[PDB]
């Protein structure tokens, strides 16, 4: 992973590490995955933990989190799928109401204006919605 990419994953990691000590468990891992439309079982989570949990306590730091993430056509297929997590009805555009759903699922607090503001700033063409290319451009800023 590049220098830019590692910094963006660190901020993402803070949604997992809500109490802010630099540490993850299976509880955190599960909560966040479900809140984005995924249902991993207890054993699946524990099985993935083992990869980089040298000391058998069930804890994980950020750099270990990155290698737990590591595995040709697969890259773009993942960014397409990330977009569809936001675009719930699959019509090709992210609406204010859809962003808010994602936002609030992840425990973020903001007003409905603030949701509209996030849409407006990501909206290059100015149609009040966020398509795939605007989503990618924002992710890459």
């Amino acid at each position: 992973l590049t220098e830019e990419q590692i910094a963006e994953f660190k901020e993402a990691f803070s949604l997992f590490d809500k109490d802010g000590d630099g540490t993850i468990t299976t509880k955190e891992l599960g909560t966040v995955m479900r809140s984005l439309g995924q249902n991993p079982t207890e054993a699946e989570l524990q099985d993935m933990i083992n990869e980089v949990d040298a000391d058998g306590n069930g804890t994980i730091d950020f750099p270990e989190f990155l290698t737990m993430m590591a595995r040709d056509t697969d890259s773009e297929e993942e960014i397409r799928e990330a977009f569809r997590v936001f675009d719930k009805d699959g019509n090709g555009f992210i609406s204010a109401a859809e962003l808010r759903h994602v936002m609030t699922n992840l425990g973020e607090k903001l007003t409905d204006e603030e949701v509209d503001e996030m849409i407006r700033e990501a909206d290059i063409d100015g149609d009040g919605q966020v398509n795939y290319e605007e989503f990618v451009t924002m992710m890459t800023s």
Binding site: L15, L36, E108, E121
Partner: protein
């Protein structure tokens, strides 16, 4: 121009103003008294917090962390019945001398289970919880070292720890009750009413709770140190002997009283309020028949106690010798001869009786502690949590052998404390990204070696004297002065600035420069006090007792100092294998009263407990630190609700983007913001300036903020997807 803290003879520090600056000292005018003026050395003057009304839960959240702001913050909290405050991972506890309402309730115990330090108000329960959590996660034994002077609160807080661990992580069940009843039983035999404390510990203890691999309680073990022998026979004007003697007389049945020939305490030489001797006997009997002591063993203990009492009544009476020899199973005529023949003078016969009394009682205390250990034993264990409860450095107008032993103990304990605090601060810097922490302490190994080194240490020099044909306190003192003439830590009493110490001759004492200050030891009775072996004629007498119990208490020179050195070294072996937390207990006044903060007295304790050395170790390149969560809590009221809706981490990155604070002065860490000297004070003042200017600074950072909020959730959804695939990728 700003007020500062400067010395005050009774408050420790007072608010004042610098009115003139000289080469060595500053001129101070007190706020209270215009026209009044005084001098203070430049290193005795400290910056004050701008807000004098606030208090923080962790003294690390102070703009300036120093002895004076620490004292003030602790004072503010104390006035509001908040007796607990942090200095990073260290807990300070101020004795309130009354019962505060919710603080120790079983409901309060529950509310602390599982929580990290700082997510709840500061509490001894939070220290106990961190010990268990670190044991479970790090697979490492834990120690909690609790110090302070007599009456400061060590025993009470130790008991709070033991109650917390037992109610929270105990078994069921039944070992639990025994663990919390162990201390109360040892106290009958080891505690005594003193001028400083009605329930004073006259011994040191280390109390271990042992666990298995699953970190379930499997047993306990109690270590005991330095039982005070002199107290058995004579005691000071306003003081008592060990509680047991007074409880036995007060609350025994007509039956026990009859068999043991017991009267009121005024009838016994060895014994002559808010002290419920009668009720305490009942509680002691409850605790005895709960650790599994039967009435047979209980009476065996009472007999020995009573026998020591009647031995004390022998002056150099007839009925006293009768009662004594019966309860200790001796021949009346054998006791008479041994107590009176080498013929012996009046003083020499008083010594023989007192020596037997002390040896019997001491050996009885050993039996009690071993008996408590037999009530919660264990085949094997994985880890322990140990609480150390022993007296700290303290002022005494006369320093003898007892003081010498405890001060030596505290040198080694303070060395451990320095080593562990240094390690935490070094670990903090690298973990947070700050590189090398260059802080250091001055080691005290040279003072440790002066006392304990083989062949040349004071302890070995003392033993040598005990073994001479004609042992002498003065020969011993000269030997020390001769061997250590030019040691940095040792001096002759006549160099003192105190006139009383200067009247002590060279062979009558010495000065040692201890961690906490110079102590002048008077060496009279050192040689006597270093030997706790009973004379062979008295030793044979008590060994051939008709009572099985008395013979088993015992089933020529024995060094008191070297026995303790061995014990202390094993304790340190243990402690060095553990992760350590530190509780510093503080006695607020000399009167046992609540809401009465004596500043100079408290300040002096903060120095003797090692909290001044500690603060120096926390003045690294970045002497100020606060976590994103606490800065968020502290300063969100000053920002627009937009910013207040984050996310303590993003809140802080936002704040330091919008204020544009230099990357040199303000270091964003992994979990904390670190401030250069004075910079936290600068930040605080900026935060409290024009609210509108602040609003405009946020506005200018709007675009970057929105993009960051977007990127946080986009990369997190990628993350989840990448993790989802890993489950599949590893499944196929």
């Amino acid at each position: 121009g700003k007020p500062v803290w400067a010395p005050h003879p009774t408050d420790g520090f007072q608010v004042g103003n610098i009115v003139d600056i000289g080469p060595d000292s500053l001129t101070i005018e007190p706020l209270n008294q215009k026209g009044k003026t005084f001098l203070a050395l430049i290193n005795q003057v400290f910056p004050a917090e701008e807000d004098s009304k606030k208090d923080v839960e962790d003294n690390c959240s102070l703009m300036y962390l120093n002895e004076a702001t620490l004292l003030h913050n602790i004072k503010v909290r104390y006035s509001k019945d908040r007796i607990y405050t942090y200095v990073a991972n260290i807990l300070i506890a101020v004795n309130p001398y009354f019962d505060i309402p919710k603080i120790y309730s079983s409901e309060t115990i529950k509310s602390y289970q599982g929580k990290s330090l700082g997510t709840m108000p500061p509490h001894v329960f939070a220290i106990a919880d961190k010990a268990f959590r670190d044991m479970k996660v790090l697979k490492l034994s834990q120690s909690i070292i609790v110090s302070g002077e007599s009456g400061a609160g060590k025993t009470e807080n130790t008991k709070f720890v033991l109650r917390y661990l037992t109610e929270s992580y105990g078994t069921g069940q039944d070992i639990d009750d025994r663990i919390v009843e162990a201390n109360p039983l040892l106290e009958a035999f080891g505690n005594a009413k003193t001028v400083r404390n009605n329930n004073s510990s006259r011994f040191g203890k280390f109390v271990e709770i042992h666990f298995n691999e699953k970190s379930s309680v499997v047993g306990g073990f109690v270590s005991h140190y330095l039982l005070e022998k002199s107290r058995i026979c004579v005691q000071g004007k306003e003081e008592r002997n060990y509680h047991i003697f007074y409880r036995l007389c007060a609350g025994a049945s007509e039956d026990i009283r009859e068999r043991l020939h017991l009267s009121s305490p005024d009838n016994f030489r060895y014994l002559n309020p808010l002290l419920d001797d009668h009720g305490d006997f009942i509680r002691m009997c409850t605790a005895m028949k709960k650790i599994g002591l039967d009435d047979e063993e209980k009476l065996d203990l009472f007999r020995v106690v009573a026998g020591v009492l009647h031995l004390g009544n022998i002056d150099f009476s007839t009925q006293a010798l009768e009662y004594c020899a019966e309860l200790l199973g001796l021949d009346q005529d054998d006791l008479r001869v041994s107590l009176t023949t080498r013929p012996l003078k009046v003083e020499q016969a008083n010594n023989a009786r007192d020596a037997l009394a002390k040896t019997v009682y001491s050996h009885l205390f050993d039996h009690v502690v071993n008996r408590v250990n037999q009530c919660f034993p264990f085949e094997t264990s994985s880890y322990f949590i140990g609480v150390l409860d022993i007296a700290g450095f303290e002022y005494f107008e006369h320093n003898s052998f007892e003081q010498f032993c405890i001060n030596y103990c505290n040198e080694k304990l303070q060395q451990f404390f320095n080593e562990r605090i240094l390690k935490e601060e070094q670990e903090l810097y690298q973990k947070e990204g700050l590189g090398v922490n260059e802080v250091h302490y001055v080691d005290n190994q040279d003072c440790i070696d002066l006392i304990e080194a083989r062949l040349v240490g004071i302890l070995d020099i003392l033993d040598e004297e005990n073994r001479l044909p004609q042992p002498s306190d003065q020969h011993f003192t000269s030997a020390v002065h001769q061997k250590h003439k030019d040691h940095f830590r040792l001096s002759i009493p006549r160099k003192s600035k105190l006139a009383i110490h200067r009247n002590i001759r060279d062979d009558e004492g010495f000065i040692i420069r201890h961690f906490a200050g110079a102590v002048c030891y008077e060496t009279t009775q050192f040689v006597e006090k270093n030997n706790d072996a009973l004379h062979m004629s008295l030793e044979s007498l008590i060994c051939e007792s008709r009572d099985k119990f008395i013979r088993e208490l015992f089933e020529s020179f024995i060094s008191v100092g070297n026995k303790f050195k061995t014990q202390l070294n094993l304790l340190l072996d243990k402690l060095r294998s553990t992760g350590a937390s530190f509780i510093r207990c503080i006695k607020p006044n000399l009167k046992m009263t609540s809401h009465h903060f004596e500043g100079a007295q408290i300040l002096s304790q903060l120095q003797c407990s090692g909290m001044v050395s500690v603060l120096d170790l926390m003045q690294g390149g970045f002497p100020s630190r606060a976590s994103f969560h606490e800065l968020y809590n502290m300063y969100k009221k000053y920002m627009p609700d937009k910013l207040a809706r984050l996310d303590p981490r993003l809140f802080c990155k936002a704040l330091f983007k919008a204020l544009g604070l230099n990357e040199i002065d303000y270091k964003f860490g992994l979990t904390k913001v670190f401030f250069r000297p004075g910079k936290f004070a600068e930040f605080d003042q900026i935060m409290k300036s024009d609210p509108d200017h602040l609003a405009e600074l946020v506005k200018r950072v709007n675009h970057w903020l929105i993009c960051s909020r977007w990127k946080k959730v986009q990369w997190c959804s990628l993350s989840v997807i990448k993790l989802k695939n890993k489950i599949k990728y590893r499944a196929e």
